[PDB]
Amino acid sequence: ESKPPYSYAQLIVQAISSAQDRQLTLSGIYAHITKHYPYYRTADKGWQNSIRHNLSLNRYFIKVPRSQEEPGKGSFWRIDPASEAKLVEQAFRKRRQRGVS
Template sequence: PYAVLIHRALMSSPEKKMVLADIYDYFREKIPRFKRVKGRGWMNSIRHNLSMNGAFLKQDRPPDDPGKGYIWVLSDEA
């Protein structure tokens, strides 16, 4: 399930948080089947899981880290 893989990705980060692009990179680099997947459906699934699963929380980027999107972290439920 995507939620388990996203959890692993976030736990692999020293600060236990990532931006969406870093989560995509984790999937491509660490999970063999995502190295060869064509299309972007898997990215949609990741975004859906981040948004709908209470185990994941989004935080605003700090002022010294401008960029697009949020920082994703694990909730206390995770």
């Protein structure tokens, strides 16, 4: 299960939102936290599939379209366009309630 310090919906925002434009391949976020976050380096045999499935039911993330043309040069998913303003407010936030400042 590992230990996700960032929700699997906010944790991804810093991934794609901070990546190139705002999209990432299924293995983008993994190179994200596993890179900057040291905790997600030896214990990743849990949230790994949590992200792939998280970008499915997430409300801001969505897969990449491919009916005729493309938005750029990639093939995977990203975060919502008009939701990156509110989904980001939690992106730069620590996971806590009000018992440990």
